[PDB]
Amino acid sequence: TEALYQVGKEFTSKMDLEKPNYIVPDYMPVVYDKLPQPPSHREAIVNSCVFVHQTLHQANARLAKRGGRTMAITPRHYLDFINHYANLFHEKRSELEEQQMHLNVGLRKIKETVDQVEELRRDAKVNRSTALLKSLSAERERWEKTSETFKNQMSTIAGDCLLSAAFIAYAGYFDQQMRQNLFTTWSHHLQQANIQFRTDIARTEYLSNADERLRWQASSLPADDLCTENAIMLKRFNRYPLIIDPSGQATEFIMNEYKDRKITRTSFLDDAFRKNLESALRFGNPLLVQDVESYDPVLNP
Amino acid sequence: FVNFTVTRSSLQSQCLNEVLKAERPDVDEKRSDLLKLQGEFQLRLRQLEKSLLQALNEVKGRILDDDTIITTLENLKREAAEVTRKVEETDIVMQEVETVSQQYLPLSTACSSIYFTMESLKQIHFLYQYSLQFFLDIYHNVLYENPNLKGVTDHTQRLSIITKDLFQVAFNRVARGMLHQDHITFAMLLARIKLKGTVG
């Protein structure tokens, strides 16, 4: 627990996870017995980040208990989770700041247009300027409230990214039911720690714009919640992905998506696999390798 | 890892979504609209502000060409209030879709059980192999091309007819490609599935 806590703190130290108004909960659940007390927002966030790893280990152990096929959980999962959390936090904060700045520019231009129509009222066009102003000011007021909402969105970003970052890193092999169970457990633990997060989060919607979903559906993506989440996992991956697709739809989806990049098909069983892999690594074209059940170890580095 | 594997819950969700789309499309709209109160609608609402600001400073005293620029400002007046109504009506809609979706849930569980039984049929005879496209085609026939639903408008009767036709069409389609010995076995499996799904 201490190693996970320390490797989390020094990777999420560059992030602005500071909240001066963080009300510490009366009774907090702790994985790191030596947490600073009373914990601050950064301390609580890192403790929750370790809760994600601990709960995932417990879930895998439970799946082993009921005879299900388990998958190894290693420190690299935690490093990938923290990297995804950092990239997602930076991306969402950058997007919100860009939107808020654009809305401030819009308010400036609305005030400029109000000045222009006031100049035009100095001059039967003049009477109806009373209507356009009645519209413009209303729009201005609307934009003002929109700006206020953005502030609340800031207060909700951090935990939300956590609940998404873990989802991108850990719960990729699990089925939909256990994915939802893990997400509910993480959300409950975040609620227990007074970390502010959206109540009704949609993972597939928080991590992808509708243009991307439309593009995926244009490709051979079966449109389901699990399939959309998987398609997101094929976009926000730090480590290369392993696609378990008995149907075979996902291979066609990857092929159609990366056709512009001239992706080429290969399999481990193929005799000319190593040379094709050498060419792909040497020149940079993307590659899809099939039949990884007979995984060659040469791909380890 | 990225698992594109069909399971009980995945097929249950797919079937429930299909039923809500086919038989209660209003709830499907109110569900797709509940996941569009996230980035989609607000992104469009401010993407319209982008075009507004593009055509707001294009002025040299010609803003009042007819004093009818408000139309461009009215196109954003409507949607905002609309996306302010749905944000206000986001708890009534959520409870409503929950209540309406739980009604159509036993059908989804029956669908998952039936498909997984068809997948289980392999170890009874080597010929008894059926793809998920087979079950989904059975469901498309049961929901859209069902002559028994014509003229029925009450939703409860439609649901009951859909369930009965699902069991019947599944048995007919599967048993047309089975030896006569195993028809009773599959019928017994479907009867057990309905007994799990039957009420009372």
Binding site: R66, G67 | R8, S113, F116, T117, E119, S120, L189
Partner: peptide, 29 residues
């Protein structure tokens, strides 16, 4: 139980226990 995957090991434990109890422990040569 290939279609049903919910408890299968809970019953299989009792079944295997009974099968062990039934068979004699050894057969003298």
């Amino acid at each position: 139980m290939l279609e049903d995957e919910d408890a299968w090991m809970r019953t299989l434990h009792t079944t295997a226990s009974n099968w062990l109890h039934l068979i004699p422990q050894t057969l003298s040569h």
